[PDB]
Amino acid sequence: SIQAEEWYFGKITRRESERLLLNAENPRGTFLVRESETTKGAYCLSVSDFDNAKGLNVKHYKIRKLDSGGFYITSRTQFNSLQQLVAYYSKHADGLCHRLTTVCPT
Numbered sequence: 001s002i003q004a005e006e007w008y009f010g011k012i013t014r015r016e017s018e019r020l021l022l023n024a025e026n027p028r029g030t031f032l033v034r035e036s037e038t039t040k041g042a043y044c045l046s047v048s049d050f051d052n053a054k055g056l057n058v059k060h061y062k063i064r065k066l067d068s069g070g071f072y073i074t075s076r077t078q079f080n081s082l083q084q085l086v087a088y089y090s091k092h093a094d095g096l097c098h099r100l101t102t103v104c105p106t
């Protein structure tokens, strides 16, 4: 159950995800997964980043789920579950702003 996952914040807004992530104590890769405001059946992986150009900032990645079963940000790299997706991106940055590190504090 994704609702069982501590990083799954459910039905929170994009502005709210940003408020929680834009905390000076959050290292790069601090994250949370929430429902998408705009796409039914889709989720959003919100991630904190930091660089000298932009300072502390947030990136949002749409996660799609096939009726066929797979979860993915890019269709070339799919997972059998949202949890396997989160585990993969915690080890590989690939196209993300940073690999996922720890769950966002509320």
Ligand SMILES: CC(=O)N[C@@H](Cc1ccc(OP(=O)(O)O)cc1)C(=O)N[C@H]1CCCCN(Cc2ccc(-c3ccccc3)cc2)C1=O
Pocket: 014, 035, 036, 037, 038, 039, 043, 044, 045, 059, 060, 061, 062, 073, 074, 093, 094, 095, 096
């Ligand atoms: C308005 C906005 O912020 N849009 C997001 C996408 C997005 C995210 C959530 C969402 O619901 P909400 O309405 O609930 O918020 C709507 C749109 C976006 O555009 N992100 C960027 C993220 C940084 C990379 C650029 N990009 C394209 C891209 C390119 C490569 C990858 C990629 C990631 C991992 C592995 C391989 C490729 C991901 C995104 C985005 O989508």
